[PDB]
Design an enzyme around this catalytic site. Structure first.
Site, mmCIF file in Angstrom:
data_model
loop_
_atom_site.group_PDB
_atom_site.id
_atom_site.type_symbol
_atom_site.label_atom_id
_atom_site.label_comp_id
_atom_site.label_asym_id
_atom_site.label_seq_id
_atom_site.Cartn_x
_atom_site.Cartn_y
_atom_site.Cartn_z
ATOM 1 C CD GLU A 32 16.269 9.923 1.300
ATOM 2 O OE1 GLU A 32 15.304 9.405 1.199
ATOM 3 O OE2 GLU A 32 17.354 9.584 1.242
HETATM 4 MG MG LIG Z 1 14.540 5.285 0.599
#
Ligand SMILES: [Mg+2]
Length: 271
Positions: free
Chosen positions: A123
């Site tokens: 991410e």
């Molecule tokens: Mg997370």
């Protein structure tokens, strides 16, 4: 009829055997996480290390749960949020060297732990271009499939990483089987009607929905599980719900609700 359960990242003692398993679903555990970083939070250029509670979730534990339940597979998720408190920044010395290390190190890990696949859950992209990320992961998945090392590849996107994961999916959809879209990124106030709308929007970005699983958190974030389950009944009634995943067994283990929503999700999928 796919149900998936993330497990192992909190080191809180949860075991595969704590999680309700319905014989009528295609059941995936997803070990969280393998990370190409050292414990000092130095990147290893794609040489993956183990950051789940592997003293508990051992190779013998994977083999045993799979031997007991023929509908169970076990995958491993890559990346996650942090490594010893630092952000897991995706980073590669070169595309070719990262890919060679990733394919080889994950093949070794998959063979050691009797695994069935990988899930992409990076991410943080502050140290890499989107093209570089997509090339690395697309090649990794493509090679593991071609080498017959995995049967299932998935991605775990949310809106904040749309640019990266839509590029990846749009390019490599033939080798990406499942989209673990994180619907627990949305607000705790989300209604069942809103969830259906949010699901449609996410599905529209990841191939239309055939591969896009609904989800909720049992760790006290996102739309309430009971509300999500209600929305999931609507999607199921429409013939447009391929499955559900939960983040996570560790969360459920530590929660007052324990594993009741894991059970409910699987019952919904099989009823
Ligand atoms: Mg997370």
């Amino acid at each position: 009829k796919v149900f998936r359960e993330y497990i192992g990242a909190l080191y809180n003692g949860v075991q595969f055997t704590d999680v309700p398993i319905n014989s009528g679903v295609t059941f995936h555990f997803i070990l969280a996480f393998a990370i190409d970083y050292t414990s000092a939070a130095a990147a290893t250029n794609g040489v993956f290390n183990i950051y789940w509670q592997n003293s508990v979730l051992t190779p013998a534990a994977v083999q045993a749960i799979k031997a007991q339940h023929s509908n169970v597979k076990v995958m491993v998720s890559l990346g996650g949020d942090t490594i010893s408190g630092s952000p897991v920044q995706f980073t590669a010395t070169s595309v070719s060297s990262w890919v060679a290390n990733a394919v080889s190190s994950l093949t070794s890990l998959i063979n050691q732990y009797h695994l069935d696949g990988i899930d992409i859950d990076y991410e943080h992209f502050d140290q890499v271009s989107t093209s570089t990320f997509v090339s690395c992961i697309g090649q990794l998945i493509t090679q593991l499939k071609a080498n017959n090392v995995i049967s299932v590849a998935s991605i775990a996107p949310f809106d904040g990483v749309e640019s990266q994961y839509t590029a990846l999916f749009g390019q490599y959809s033939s080798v990406i089987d499942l989209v673990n879209f994180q619907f627990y990124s949305y607000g705790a106030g989300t209604s069942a009607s809103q969830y259906v709308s949010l699901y449609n929007t996410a599905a529209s970005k990841y191939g239309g929905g055939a591969k896009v699983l609904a989800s909720f958190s049992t760790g006290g974030v996102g739309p309430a599980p009971s509300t999500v389950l209600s929305a999931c009944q609507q999607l199921k009634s429409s013939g447009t719900l391929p499955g559900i995943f939960i983040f996570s067994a560790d969360g459920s283990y530590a929660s007052s609700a324990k594993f009741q929503y894991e059970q409910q999700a699987q019952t919904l999928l099989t009823s």
